[PDB]
Amino acid sequence: ESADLRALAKHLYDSYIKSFPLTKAKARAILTGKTTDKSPFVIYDMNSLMMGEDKIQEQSKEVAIRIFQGCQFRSVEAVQEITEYAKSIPGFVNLDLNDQVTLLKYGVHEIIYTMLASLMNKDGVLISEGQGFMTREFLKSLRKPFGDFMEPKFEFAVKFNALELDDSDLAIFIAVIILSGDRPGLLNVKPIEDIQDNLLQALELQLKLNHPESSQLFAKLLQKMTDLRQIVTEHVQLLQVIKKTETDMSLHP
Amino acid sequence: ESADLRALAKHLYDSYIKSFPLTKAKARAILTGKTTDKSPFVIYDMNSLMMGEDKIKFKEVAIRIFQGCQFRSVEAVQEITEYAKSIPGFVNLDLNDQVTLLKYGVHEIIYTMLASLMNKDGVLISEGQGFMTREFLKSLRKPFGDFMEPKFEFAVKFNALELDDSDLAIFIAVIILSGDRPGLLNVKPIEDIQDNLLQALELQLKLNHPESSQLFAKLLQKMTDLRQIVTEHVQLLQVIKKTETDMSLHPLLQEIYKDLY
Amino acid sequence: ESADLRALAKHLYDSYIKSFPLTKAKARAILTGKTTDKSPFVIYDMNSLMMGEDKIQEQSKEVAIRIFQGCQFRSVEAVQEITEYAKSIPGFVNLDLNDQVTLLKYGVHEIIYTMLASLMNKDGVLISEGQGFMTREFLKSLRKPFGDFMEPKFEFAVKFNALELDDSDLAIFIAVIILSGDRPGLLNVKPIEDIQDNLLQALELQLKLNHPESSQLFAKLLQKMTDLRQIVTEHVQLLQVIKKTETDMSLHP
Amino acid sequence: ESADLRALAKHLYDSYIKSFPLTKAKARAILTGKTTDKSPFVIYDMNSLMMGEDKIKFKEVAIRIFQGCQFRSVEAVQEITEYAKSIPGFVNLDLNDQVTLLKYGVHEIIYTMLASLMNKDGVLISEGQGFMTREFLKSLRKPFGDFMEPKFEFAVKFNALELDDSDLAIFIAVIILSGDRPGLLNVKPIEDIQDNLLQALELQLKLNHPESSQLFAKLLQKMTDLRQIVTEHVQLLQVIKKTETDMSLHPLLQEIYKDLY
Ligand SMILES: CCCc1c(OCCCn2ccc3cc(OCC(=O)O)ccc32)ccc2cc(C(=O)c3ccccc3)ccc12
Ligand SMILES: CCCc1c(OCCCn2ccc3cc(OCC(=O)O)ccc32)ccc2cc(C(=O)c3ccccc3)ccc12
């Protein structure tokens, strides 16, 4: 019934709030400006990065490489918030432990880029739990292999954010992504699709009720999931370029 | 022979009274107020449920009631196992078959004896200290609502048979000694014991209920109502696995449900 | 009167015969040898145990632990024969149901060791309804905690068997043990002692008539009841050692 | 609070099962034959060692066994690092402190979990495919003989505590989050996490082992047995440097031992 789908949406929203402290609502307030009690420091070039560097990884390498490696560090931090959120998705913890691992392994990147768009506008991205803001232009200016890393993320985010989803929408969308029955090496696919069908029903009703004037938003959101998959494949592609072409190494395992 | 069969009937009734504190006789006294010691607190909605739980002085509700169910089921399994040990010939069987008979028989017996605690309006809970209404249980959010109603439907029809504890003692033994359980290694010795129990049950019913036409057959037909209840229950368990978060049962209940039909 | 005490002794003897198929008389014939139509297989070591193992619980554990657990299994089988015998003791079934349970709970172990002595000689014990014979030496050779388990049973049995009691004596002695008014948590002690007094009278006359040359056998037999209680307490003691000190578990409830 | 502490205990047990294929439960099944799939090949002398190594069909021995030790240690470090990442709050720490916690904690955890694979007679080797006897290990030429015996002495006493995998999951996290490691930059945030883990461990032990008096304290006392094992081991490493020819470890193991206590 409709009530049960709404209860599931609410349960997911409350868990999401518990697992992810920097929510889209909080982040949008910062990107604009409501009661500026603590306006974030803006990193717009090499010198402003230094300015903030010894304001709050530390210095002793190519800035380009410290920024790229900082991306790695934060992304592993994020995996842990996502893993905990996943446990709250009804039916996830009762899946084969091995399939849980696989679901997380191949879903975490798509989720990071989804939630990263909450922290972005067309001109830059919130960093350090929202205390900083790094410009898209500065990131774009970094050394050749590295100057192209965030751009596809920004491009996705501008198009994704024009959908105007809120946290209650995103909570369900994220759960839908995790419960993807098409991940490599899953053992028991049917149970996963069974849960995803329930989550898709809940997502569909959520968007129809929250965005009644946005025609076919549900289909449009599903379409963004090929966008996300492509972004990940490029990012993974890009990580090969690096792995082979650098004197630099010291990655988060 | 007749005196053997009555001695067997009496032995079972004896062990039953020894193994199961809340008998049918005792439940009926309570349900009917023939007792004048402690009338049960009735739970019919969320407000009375809160009061009922907090009456301890002198997660969610649907998963919370499921959890009590689990605890009580474990307690029931312990009682039924003690009863089973007393059935002549049971402990002499292959140990793996004893396990197999308990694994498949325990839930059939749980629903049989639950009927003793039910009327068409509700079920006795907390060693008969509370009464939870059928309508309240029916109300519970989707899947959890579907757990108890089939039991009520069975119980009202089963209770119309008017069996008493002495009848039930032999019927429960019949259920345990079922030679058709999956994975049984030595079927005939079980069937031979069941034959003797069936003989004793038939005699017990003809003597205790002489005016009840074909009661023996009618009771054996309930064994198909029972087997249906259990497969429905196991199905519902798979629904709870998909729609609920952290569940995981007691080690005893997990073993019983492990690779069950 | 004397006749009534003899009638009670006979009633108990007939019930005993009905409840316990392997009687002392049958077992003594086997431990010696009268018309050897089916001489029992002797288990005198690890390899002879295997020999018989796949001759007739099954193999997949420390032999020591399978033997000890076999002891548990058989002892629960024996409780059921004892429970049925108890019903035939005049007045037992009319006692409070709860007291019946308690009498059996705390009496069953003493009875098992009493009747076990019928199946023993100084060198070993009949097993598998008399089809096998396990040596005392082999049992003694088992792993440290377990090699000490049966010895006290053998020690008791050698001294007990020197009393030369027969089944008709034992039937009454067993009934005397069950009707012990000193068991913990009995509700109505007087009715139990009333019945035990009757059984003691019958036992005393039985021994005076059956063993007239055995001076004070009655007193001597009563004295064995502290021996039995001590054996049980040690065995229970020993079960604590195990319960705490083993990777092994899977006991008869 | 209580439900938080049980949720933490459950999360750790979950990650532990995910990060460590050969658990205690699985080692005990093997050591005890409760499994009926593949009984381990026992190595007790040089002749059985040869046969054991050449059973791959379906330098010197003392340095050769040391080398397997090294390979397995590296594999263990990878598993423990994956486990550590899952401990709530760990990846949020200063990266240099994360490294420092792994560097000093890894060997304490290796010997803790090795105990799971040991009885008083020997140790499971090759993902539980082999069993190498304590006496054989004790036999090894001077210095190499001295490596394994202290581990056995610890394991038998540790194993008497009867911890299970769910207990061990939280104890290993306690070990990792030790605020007293040399060179830690931010001690308090580590100590705060360890406080919470200690709370969860205490509750887990009281619930899982209610009859085990002062088990929590007894377990924490093992942390001093463990720290002693590691300093002894590092000492022994310096002996191997003087009495052996070309050794040199894996890059991962060299980093861990680099300027270690
Ligand atoms: C055999 C369970 C009997 C039963 C009960 O029977 C309703 C019929 C539905 N039903 C029968 C068996 C059974 C098993 C079940 O799951 C068992 C399992 O998962 O192991 C779910 C529902 C169920 C309703 C409420 C109870 C409520 C309680 C409680 O003590 C209780 C505990 C906490 C809070 C409120 C109430 C115990 C038993 C109940
Ligand atoms: C954590 C090591 C566990 C372990 C083992 O434990 C015995 C306790 C002694 N011990 C514990 C840790 C440790 C580390 C050590 O050096 C480690 C290092 O230098 O990095 C030497 C001995 C040692 C014995 C034999 C093994 C043998 C093997 C092998 O797979 C093997 C490989 C090649 C040939 C034979 C066997 C793996 C692990 C063993």
PDB file of N, CA, C and O in Angstrom, chain A residues 20 38 57 87 119 125 136 166 182 184 186:
ATOM      1  N   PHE A  20      24.689  10.821   7.410  1.00  0.00           N
ATOM      2  CA  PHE A  20      25.368  11.850   6.613  1.00  0.00           C
ATOM      3  C   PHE A  20      25.131  13.240   7.189  1.00  0.00           C
ATOM      4  O   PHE A  20      24.138  13.896   6.872  1.00  0.00           O
ATOM      5  N   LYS A  38      29.371  31.854   9.771  1.00  0.00           N
ATOM      6  CA  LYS A  38      30.647  31.148   9.626  1.00  0.00           C
ATOM      7  C   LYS A  38      31.000  30.871   8.159  1.00  0.00           C
ATOM      8  O   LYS A  38      31.290  29.721   7.786  1.00  0.00           O
ATOM      9  N   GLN A  57      45.876  16.070   4.900  1.00  0.00           N
ATOM     10  CA  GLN A  57      47.297  15.916   4.567  1.00  0.00           C
ATOM     11  C   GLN A  57      48.060  17.255   4.619  1.00  0.00           C
ATOM     12  O   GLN A  57      47.460  18.326   4.540  1.00  0.00           O
ATOM     13  N   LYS A  87      23.236  -0.511   6.022  1.00  0.00           N
ATOM     14  CA  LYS A  87      22.686  -1.449   7.005  1.00  0.00           C
ATOM     15  C   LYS A  87      21.234  -1.135   7.351  1.00  0.00           C
ATOM     16  O   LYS A  87      20.439  -2.024   7.689  1.00  0.00           O
ATOM     17  N   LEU A 119      27.137  19.079  -2.785  1.00  0.00           N
ATOM     18  CA  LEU A 119      28.113  20.015  -2.225  1.00  0.00           C
ATOM     19  C   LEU A 119      28.678  20.977  -3.268  1.00  0.00           C
ATOM     20  O   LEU A 119      29.550  21.796  -2.957  1.00  0.00           O
ATOM     21  N   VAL A 125      33.199  23.619  -5.102  1.00  0.00           N
ATOM     22  CA  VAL A 125      32.733  22.502  -4.259  1.00  0.00           C
ATOM     23  C   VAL A 125      33.054  22.782  -2.789  1.00  0.00           C
ATOM     24  O   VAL A 125      34.130  23.307  -2.465  1.00  0.00           O
ATOM     25  N   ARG A 136      36.063  25.541  -9.001  1.00  0.00           N
ATOM     26  CA  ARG A 136      36.135  24.677 -10.148  1.00  0.00           C
ATOM     27  C   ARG A 136      37.283  25.142 -11.054  1.00  0.00           C
ATOM     28  O   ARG A 136      38.019  24.313 -11.591  1.00  0.00           O
ATOM     29  N   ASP A 166      15.645  16.844  -3.148  1.00  0.00           N
ATOM     30  CA  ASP A 166      16.002  17.150  -1.770  1.00  0.00           C
ATOM     31  C   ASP A 166      16.531  15.887  -1.072  1.00  0.00           C
ATOM     32  O   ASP A 166      16.619  14.834  -1.715  1.00  0.00           O
ATOM     33  N   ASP A 182      22.800  -6.016 -10.791  1.00  0.00           N
ATOM     34  CA  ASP A 182      23.688  -6.255 -11.929  1.00  0.00           C
ATOM     35  C   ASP A 182      25.182  -6.121 -11.629  1.00  0.00           C
ATOM     36  O   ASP A 182      25.981  -6.095 -12.569  1.00  0.00           O
ATOM     37  N   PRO A 184      28.934  -7.211 -10.774  1.00  0.00           N
ATOM     38  CA  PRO A 184      29.745  -8.408 -11.030  1.00  0.00           C
ATOM     39  C   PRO A 184      29.915  -9.294  -9.808  1.00  0.00           C
ATOM     40  O   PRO A 184      30.159  -8.792  -8.709  1.00  0.00           O
ATOM     41  N   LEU A 186      27.917 -11.114  -7.971  1.00  0.00           N
ATOM     42  CA  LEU A 186      26.889 -11.344  -6.966  1.00  0.00           C
ATOM     43  C   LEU A 186      26.446 -12.793  -7.057  1.00  0.00           C
ATOM     44  O   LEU A 186      26.356 -13.321  -8.158  1.00  0.00           O
TER      45      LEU A 186
END
